[PDB]
Amino acid sequence: LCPPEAEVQIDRLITGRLQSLQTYVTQQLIRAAEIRASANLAATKMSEC
Amino acid sequence: LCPPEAEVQIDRLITGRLQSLQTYVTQQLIRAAEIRASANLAATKMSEC
Known part of the structure; x- marks a missing residue:
């Protein structure tokens, strides 16, 4: 595809890929x-046990 | 721009701005x-220390 019609197809891929990445990070x-809560518990057990 | 072609440009801004706000809130x-976990710990230390 050429530049005016590539910027339509590409934008669709950017939107989907950006959404996928945001989902991952969240x-x-x-x-x-x-994990932090587990680590805090492990640290407490280390001290007290 | 005029009303049929403004509703295209505006929708793009709404989508992006709405996404930005949802990201912030999350x-x-x-x-x-x-912070709540920290406050709960501080409250425990207040009681026990």
């Missing part, structure tokens, strides 16, 4: 929180 | 959770 932040 | 909810 999920990682939520999972990170769970 | 990040605030995740950060809020971290």
Whole structure:
């Protein structure tokens, strides 16, 4: 395809790929929180046990 | 621009601005959770220390 009609097809790929990446990052932040809580518990057990 | 062709340009701005705002709010909810956990720990230390 040529430049006016490429910028339509490309924008569709950018939108989808950007959405996919945002989904990934959000999920990682939520999972990170769970791991942090586990690490905090492990650190407490290290101190107290 | 005139009304049929403004509703195309505007919709693009609405989509982007709405996405930006949703991103902000999601990040605030995740950060809020971290602060809450810290506050819960501080409250525990207040009681026990």
